[PDB]
Amino acid sequence: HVIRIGGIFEYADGPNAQVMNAEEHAFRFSANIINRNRTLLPNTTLTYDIQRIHFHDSFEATKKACDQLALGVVAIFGPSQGSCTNAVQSICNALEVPHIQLRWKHHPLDNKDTFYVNLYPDYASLSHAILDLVQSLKWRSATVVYDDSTGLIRLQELIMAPSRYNIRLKIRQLPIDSDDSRPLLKEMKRGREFRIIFDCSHTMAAQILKQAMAMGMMTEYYHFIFTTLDLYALDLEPYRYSGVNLTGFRILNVDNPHVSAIVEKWSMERLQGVMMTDAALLYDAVHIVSVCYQRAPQMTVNSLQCHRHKAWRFGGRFMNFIKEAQWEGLTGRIVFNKTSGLRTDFDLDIISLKEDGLEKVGVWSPADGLNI
Amino acid sequence: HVIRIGGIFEYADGPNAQVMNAEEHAFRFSANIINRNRTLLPNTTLTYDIQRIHFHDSFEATKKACDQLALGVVAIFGPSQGSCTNAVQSICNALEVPHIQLRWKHHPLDNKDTFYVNLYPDYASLSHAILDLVQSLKWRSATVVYDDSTGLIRLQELIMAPSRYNIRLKIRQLPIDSDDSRPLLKEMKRGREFRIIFDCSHTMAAQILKQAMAMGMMTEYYHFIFTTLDLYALDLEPYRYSGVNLTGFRILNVDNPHVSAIVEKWSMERDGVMMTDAALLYDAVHIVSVCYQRAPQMTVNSLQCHRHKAWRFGGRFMNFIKEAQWEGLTGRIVFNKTSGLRTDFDLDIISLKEDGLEKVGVWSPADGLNI
Amino acid sequence: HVIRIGGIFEYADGPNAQVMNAEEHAFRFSANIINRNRTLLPNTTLTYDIQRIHFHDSFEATKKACDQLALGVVAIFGPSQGSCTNAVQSICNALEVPHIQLRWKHHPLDNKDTFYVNLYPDYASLSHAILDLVQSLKWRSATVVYDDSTGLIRLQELIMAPSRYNIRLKIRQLPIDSDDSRPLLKEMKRGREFRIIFDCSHTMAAQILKQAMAMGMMTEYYHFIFTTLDLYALDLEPYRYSGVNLTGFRILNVDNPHVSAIVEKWSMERDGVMMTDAALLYDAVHIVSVCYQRAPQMTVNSLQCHRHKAWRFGGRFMNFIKEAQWEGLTGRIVFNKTSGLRTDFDLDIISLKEDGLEKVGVWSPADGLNI
Amino acid sequence: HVIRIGGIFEYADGPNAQVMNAEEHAFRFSANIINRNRTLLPNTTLTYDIQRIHFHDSFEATKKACDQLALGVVAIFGPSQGSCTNAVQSICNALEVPHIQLRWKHHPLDNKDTFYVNLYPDYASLSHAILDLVQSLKWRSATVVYDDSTGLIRLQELIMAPSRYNIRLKIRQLPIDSDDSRPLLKEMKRGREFRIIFDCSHTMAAQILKQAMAMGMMTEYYHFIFTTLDLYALDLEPYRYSGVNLTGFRILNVDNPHVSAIVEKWSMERLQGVMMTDAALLYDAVHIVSVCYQRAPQMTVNSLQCHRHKAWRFGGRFMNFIKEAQWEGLTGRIVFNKTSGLRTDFDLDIISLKEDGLEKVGVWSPADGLNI
Numbered sequence A, D: 001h002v003i004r005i006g007g008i009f010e011y012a013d014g015p016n017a018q019v020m021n022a023e024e025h026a027f028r029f030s031a032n033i034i035n036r037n038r039t040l041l042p043n044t045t046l047t048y049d050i051q052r053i054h055f056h057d058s059f060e061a062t063k064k065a066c067d068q069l070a071l072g073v074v075a076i077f078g079p080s081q082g083s084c085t086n087a088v089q090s091i092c093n094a095l096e097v098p099h100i101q102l103r104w105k106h107h108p109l110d111n112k113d114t115f116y117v118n119l120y121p122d123y124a125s126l127s128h129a130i131l132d133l134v135q136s137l138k139w140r141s142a143t144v145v146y147d148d149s150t151g152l153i154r155l156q157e158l159i160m161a162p163s164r165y166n167i168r169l170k171i172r173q174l175p176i177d178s179d180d181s182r183p184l185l186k187e188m189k190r191g192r193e194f195r196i197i198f199d200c201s202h203t204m205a206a207q208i209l210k211q212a213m214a215m216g217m218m219t220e221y222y223h224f225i226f227t228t229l230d231l232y233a234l235d236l237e238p239y240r241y242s243g244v245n246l247t248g249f250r251i252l253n254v255d256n257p258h259v260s261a262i263v264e265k266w267s268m269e270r271l272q273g274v275m276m277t278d279a280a281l282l283y284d285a286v287h288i289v290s291v292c293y294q295r296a297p298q299m300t301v302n303s304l305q306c307h308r309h310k311a312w313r314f315g316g317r318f319m320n321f322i323k324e325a326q327w328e329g330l331t332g333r334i335v336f337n338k339t340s341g342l343r344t345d346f347d348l349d350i351i352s353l354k355e356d357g358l359e360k361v362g363v364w365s366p367a368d369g370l371n372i
Numbered sequence B, C: 001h002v003i004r005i006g007g008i009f010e011y012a013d014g015p016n017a018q019v020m021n022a023e024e025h026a027f028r029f030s031a032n033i034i035n036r037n038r039t040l041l042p043n044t045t046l047t048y049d050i051q052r053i054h055f056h057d058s059f060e061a062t063k064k065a066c067d068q069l070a071l072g073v074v075a076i077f078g079p080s081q082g083s084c085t086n087a088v089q090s091i092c093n094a095l096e097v098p099h100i101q102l103r104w105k106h107h108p109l110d111n112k113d114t115f116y117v118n119l120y121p122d123y124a125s126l127s128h129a130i131l132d133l134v135q136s137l138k139w140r141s142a143t144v145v146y147d148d149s150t151g152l153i154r155l156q157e158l159i160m161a162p163s164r165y166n167i168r169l170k171i172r173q174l175p176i177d178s179d180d181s182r183p184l185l186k187e188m189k190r191g192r193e194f195r196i197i198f199d200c201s202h203t204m205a206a207q208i209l210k211q212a213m214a215m216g217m218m219t220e221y222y223h224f225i226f227t228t229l230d231l232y233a234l235d236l237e238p239y240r241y242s243g244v245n246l247t248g249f250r251i252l253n254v255d256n257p258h259v260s261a262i263v264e265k266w267s268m269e270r271d272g273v274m275m276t277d278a279a280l281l282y283d284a285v286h287i288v289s290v291c292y293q294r295a296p297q298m299t300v301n302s303l304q305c306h307r308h309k310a311w312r313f314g315g316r317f318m319n320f321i322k323e324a325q326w327e328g329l330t331g332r333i334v335f336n337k338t339s340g341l342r343t344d345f346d347l348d349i350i351s352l353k354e355d356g357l358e359k360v361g362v363w364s365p366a367d368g369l370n371i
């Protein structure tokens, strides 16, 4: 028996890209592991259709989503952008095939699509986990530095802190033109802002650290908190002995033996090298959709046509399994809110930079709050 | 001769909707007025295709845009919500037909689409006017109250003020599960927050005023600023004798006699007012019509979204539209040539006195405030 | 006509070494430039013998010096390390051929050799400039960090300050078994030692800066002084925006246009810089050439170290060299007539600003500091 | 059987010197005793070649070292200066005949000669023995007065005291021009510096005492520590009753009967009168090299030529015996560090001036520290 899934990935070169990125590789990686796994889909071969497209091309994303639907798939692991994903989301809702999302995207409440889940930990919860950390460090003031216009929406639960708890916090945006953040850092330095929360990509975080050291802000006077769940992927050796306090989060359950086995195996496969959060969530996504097909009553992949009208009769029940799903993945205990389909409940590691290196100094969940 | 514009509008019932909404009306209304203007497209006839769809339905929007492109249009006037226009923009760009946009949309920098303009005043500029106004009242501390998450992304040049200036700024959000903003208001009142900025629709604004009064907050101790451009359209009679300071903006150039004439024609087809959406759509349709007249000869073509052919004269037309300069209902209209966004524009500043709401100044990105 | 200078240089592989080092290059480079200067030894041709030897090998040095004297030279340019030149100096003095020295050497008072000069600025004078600078920053307490034992003998006029002035001075040494100065740095940081003087090579200095930053000590709370004359040659871009105060000295007269011209020719044969060793060797070779031209007629002779004959014109030449006065790459050059040492010279004082490293003064044994 | 050793000694008059100095006499003295000793080299006559040269003449030192090497010797007891000795050291390393050193000399680490030992107690250890004394006297401050530029290098372990233990110490240099140290003593007196450590020759120490008494600093308010191991050779009778505290060291094991027998016999030989440290170390050196030749397997003295290339085949093994050597000499328990060849482990007497005269009030070694 053969079952098929669809993946759409964004590449700087679109369809012409010749070298495979980590998302797509993680995809192919997890499909292969499930096919060598004797306990999961033992008699079914999990195959895929992979489509490569330019960044920020909704139209192209629509064209490929329809192609895959015509080819027949049980789910579409939609594109990684926020604009491209809100087009495939609508299509998956019309044709009733599950859409799987890996990165935070804005879900307007007044938007009534239900045919999706989202594996990235919800930013409302993340904002709370940051607040519990900050209240625990006793900070009475702090600055929030975010990258793109979207940070304010992601951090709204955090920005509305002054009106609840007693912490005055300033708010600054990294330059849109340049990725030279020195002029900003000069302003924070002059402003004696010593406790800072940086919301931004692991890439941009590496830059900010390098440049904070150039500005003489990598000392015992400073405490940085990073929102990136890929903190453990930064080379922090050049900053290890400076004496800065540096704290962030980790959702990847490294303390678990079979997870470490998978991350090691993953890096052995890489040719460009750790497993970042993007790949780990996709590996978990492909597993949840597989595990769910197995517990779902027998269904078939149907060729659906976007211009046509027919929907997928099995979709509704399948989507329900996925939502109700609860599975232990690389990124720990996985579960979605049943109505929103968002991953608003999860477990975080609180990690902190020591001389000896990054160290797990606690944990957090929405129910138990902080625990150091 | 005949030119055809495509229009896509969003409804709660989708296509099934029975009644036109204000926007679709302002669309039909403005196409009709140019066909009667003998000084504008005199011997050419503007026509339109009109599609109705459900809110937040990009898939539907996609299909209707493609239907229209296959029909032959020189421009498409996209939906309102910010989710659908991402899809239609992308299409208009692949086939190179101008996409006219009327409401604020997030335009990521990474995004390389060029076949659009957007007639809504850029919120980065509105944010700057709001700062100029706050600092002009000499406010040292305020409270920013907003509605949908997207309000943040908009007022950002304002939220980042407590480090570009001496001002302390609390932040709150209207209830998402209700229209009952009373509980919030109790907390602002306890908080002794007297100077407040409300980002929200004119509808919400009317609800907020009525509830603010009920809460004992409509007095001379309070000063509210509204960012809604539709402020002048609210019934403020229940409030003008309370002592409250109430201030905001207006982009509809009502001072102009010819605008006032038009605002009257329209409101006689709708107290004798024309909202921003309607007036911006009216200005969009004119701008496109006038840029067609002005440009060289060109032909409309049927285009397939599955085929791979772009509109020949597309690029030529799109530049006429980006470079356009036009005195519309909403004042002088001009676009940033690079971004296609309306970052330069004029605002009238209005305020609530006993004699009623009145213009107590002006603003522009160049001159800032003038009173 | 032909004059011949002898050069002895030290290498890790000794004679076997394949690649020239900077010094031997600056030697060949400077002999070549005078042979092209028609205003200097116009109709006479400067040539050289060059010997390579192992570091710290006086026996080898002895043999090569003797080889060269038997070949016929008007001067010998001794090795770098301080162990070997004691031997070659003694030889040059017995046979009375000038020994040119380029690096600091201990010159015991009991020692009665007179056939040498030494172009390195005397460290007793450098020590005085370092005091003038410290007392000018109004430092009340510092920490002197040095590399090799010999650093002490050099900074002595500075170490003896806490009884010739009100200043309290801790003393530390870089690890001898490692280049990892981090552990030391931890102890200075705990010690709250913020004002620090580093005596060490430019290489070591670069290591120290990089490790100081890693240790969280490159900030506005710290002020480092470097005694290395090669400071202006370090890449300080990673550090100029941190706020650190960084100060030191420069004897290369880079302000002078003609020096800058030359520094450029050389670095195009090596970011476009010329270290002190290279520039001092260049000045030595000129000084000797110019003192030959200026002196009376004289002949080179083959001399045996086992025989007992001294160079006839030796003493006459040696006095021309000791009494020499010359504007070289390293500024005005002049020697103490008695000691043959360079105790009088000019220093530019440089400091690290955002705009980069720059000259914020000058110094000389006569006028002391001037800012 | 005849075996031969080489000695080079520095004389103010060089080769023309007619009156023999104490070093050279000690040399000739020990050779004679070994030749009358029935238990040490019973069947071998120890002969020598002695060369006299000017002070600070490396070239001359090289010429004589080569002459002796051509003549064939089993060791060369190199010249007493620091500049002259670092030339013979190199030669002995090339030709592989042991070089024997009697006085502290700078051994740059980056210098890779191995064909030498040095009998003077290492100054790093001496600095430690001084520190243990000072910490034991409870001094919280003190001045260090040294003579020639070299003192700082010899005393580095002591000068870096402030950053380890808690003792603030000033640092002053005796005048290079003059041996009139009164102007300096005036400055220390005015500066109320009462606890002083003088690093300098026994000759210069005698001068400083005489002049400290003239300056009225020879009282119960003052405590002087002298580094010179020749302290016992100073006439301290004029200062004995002043009440000053005056402490120094002694490596010459006087408490040993056969040592006193040798020192008495030595003074009986002198015509210019105690045995100073210079002569005693040379007597010990000549003995260690003899004792080592006897335990070494049979070897021969070879005529080596400096211009030639050949080295001495027996040298390496001989040098090894010498380094590994451990012998009780006039200067107590003798042993070298096997890699450095320096005498960094030894035993000191702590002596102090009383009314009744100089008295042994304790002992010190690097392992046991101080013991009073």
Ligand SMILES: *[C@@H]1O[C@H](CO)[C@@H](O)[C@H](O)[C@H]1NC(C)=O
Pocket: A033, A036, A037, A038, A039, A040, A258
């Ligand atoms: C097989 O799949 C099961 C169920 O998810 C998982 O627990 C197990 O680790 C997998 N085995 C291997 C070795 O892949």
Ligand SMILES: *[C@@H]1O[C@H](CO)[C@@H](O)[C@H](O)[C@H]1NC(C)=O
Pocket: A194, A195, A220, A221, A222, A223, A244, A245
């Ligand atoms: C850094 O952490 C330490 C100890 O964990 C804390 O005492 C200190 O306040 C922190 N630094 C800042 C600037 O908060």
Ligand SMILES: *[C@@H]1O[C@H](CO)[C@@H](O)[C@H](O)[C@H]1NC(C)=O
Pocket: A337, A338, A339, A340
């Ligand atoms: C799940 O999300 C929904 C939709 O926002 C929310 O109303 C509900 O409170 C959540 N369920 C629970 C019990 O957390």
Ligand SMILES: *[C@@H]1O[C@H](CO)[C@@H](O)[C@H](O)[C@H]1NC(C)=O
Pocket: B194, B195, B220, B221, B222, B223, B244, B245
């Ligand atoms: C209302 O406006 C008046 C002046 O126009 C000002 O004096 C007063 O302070 C304002 N009210 C508040 C609470 O700011």
Ligand SMILES: *[C@@H]1O[C@H](CO)[C@@H](O)[C@H](O)[C@H]1NC(C)=O
Pocket: B336, B337, B338, B339
């Ligand atoms: C148009 O807008 C962009 C983006 O905000 C801005 O950077 C640029 O200055 C504007 N272009 C011109 C030439 O005015």
Ligand SMILES: *[C@@H]1O[C@H](CO)[C@@H](O)[C@H](O)[C@H]1NC(C)=O
Pocket: C194, C195, C220, C221, C222, C223, C244, C245
């Ligand atoms: C750095 O230099 C400035 C003035 O140039 C001085 O005020 C400051 O104290 C210096 N830093 C230290 C730690 O001495």
Ligand SMILES: *[C@@H]1O[C@H](CO)[C@@H](O)[C@H](O)[C@H]1NC(C)=O
Pocket: C336, C337, C338, C339
């Ligand atoms: C040369 O140097 C010596 C030694 O430092 C010094 O004493 C003397 O004053 C100098 N000679 C002259 C005449 O300048």
Ligand SMILES: *[C@@H]1O[C@H](CO)[C@@H](O)[C@H](O)[C@H]1NC(C)=O
Pocket: D033, D036, D037, D038, D039, D040, D258
């Ligand atoms: C003979 O030499 C031995 C061994 O060093 C020594 O112990 C003894 O004192 C010597 N005897 C005499 C009287 O010289």
Ligand SMILES: *[C@@H]1O[C@H](CO)[C@@H](O)[C@H](O)[C@H]1NC(C)=O
Pocket: D194, D195, D220, D221, D222, D223, D244, D245
């Ligand atoms: C001299 O020694 C005595 C007793 O041994 C001691 O009490 C006194 O403090 C010493 N003098 C000085 C100046 O240290």
Ligand SMILES: *[C@@H]1O[C@H](CO)[C@@H](O)[C@H](O)[C@H]1NC(C)=O
Pocket: D337, D338, D339, D340
């Ligand atoms: C002997 O000296 C060597 C060379 O400096 C040193 O490394 C070693 O620690 C010493 N040996 C011992 C065990 O004292």
Ligand SMILES: [Cl-]
Pocket: A040, A041, A042, A043, A044
């Ligand atoms: Cl199966």
Ligand SMILES: [Cl-]
Pocket: B206, B233, B234, B235
């Ligand atoms: Cl109303």
Ligand SMILES: [Cl-]
Pocket: C206, C233, C234, C235
């Ligand atoms: Cl460098």
Ligand SMILES: [Cl-]
Pocket: D040, D041, D042, D043, D044
């Ligand atoms: Cl025998």
